[PDB]
Amino acid sequence: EEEAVRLYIQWLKEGGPSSGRPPPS
Numbered sequence: 001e002e003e004a005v006r007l008y009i010q011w012l013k014e015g016g017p018s019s020g021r022p023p024p025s
Contacts, residue, residue, distance in 0.1 A: 004024045004025060005024070005025075007024040008023055008024040008025065010024070011023045011024055
């Protein structure tokens with residue numbers, strides 16, 4: 001498991017594409 005994927009899942013769960021930001025990777 002990554003952190004950057006952790007972040008991903010972060011980004012994602014915090015909104016992902018609809019969080020006003022592009023994903024970690």
